[PDB]
Design a protein around this nucleic acid. Structure first.
Length: 167
RNA sequence: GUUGUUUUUUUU
């Protein structure tokens, strides 16, 4: 947790030119990479921004986090050290009680490790949960643990066995 | 009974 940031939810048509102007506005930028699939060069939808000062980095988070750019809302946060340990940490859960909430998810899945991002898919019309959700842990061991502890078991408040697998 | 994130969080 220092100067390196990971920018998420970037519109596909965002150029390095844009990333720069946007983040440069906070303080001097060391580097700005958009991360796109080699060959086709299509944005993986995220980027890293290495500021020069730990202070500038922090402030970027405070100001740019959540700002809307065209169709998306950016999500700026400190990058976690890479590695094999961050691998296979995204979970695809289904058969979740339809009365589920972000706080229950936290209770159920938060004991096995530290959640980095979670999303309860909701019906666009009703706004009610569809029973699906994506939970992304910090370490690869937490997801594995989460999986074996919750797969095929009935969650509290529900009458149906959860389904937890790697996305 | 096949629900899939603001499709895409580790350097593409």
């Amino acid at each position: 947790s220092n100067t390196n940031l990971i920018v998420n939810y970037l519109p596909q048509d965002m150029t390095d030119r844009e990333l720069y102007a946007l983040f440069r506005a906070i303080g001097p930028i060391n580097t700005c990479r958009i991360m796109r699939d080699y060959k086709t060069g299509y944005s993986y939808g995220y980027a890293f921004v290495d500021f020069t000062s730990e202070m500038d980095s922090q402030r970027a988070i405070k100001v740019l986090n959540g700002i809307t750019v065209r169709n998306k809302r950016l999500k700026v946060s400190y990058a976690r050290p890479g590695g094999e340990s961050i691998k296979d940490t995204n979970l695809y859960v289904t058969n979740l009680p339809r009365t589920i909430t972000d706080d229950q998810l936290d209770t159920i899945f938060g004991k096995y490790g530290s959640i980095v991002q979670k999303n309860i898919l909701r019906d666009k019309l009703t706004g009610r949960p569809r029973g699906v959700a994506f939970v992304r842990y910090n370490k690869r061991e937490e997801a594995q643990e989460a999986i074996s502890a919750l797969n095929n078991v009935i969650p509290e408040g529900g009458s149906q066995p959860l389904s937890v697998r790697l996305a």
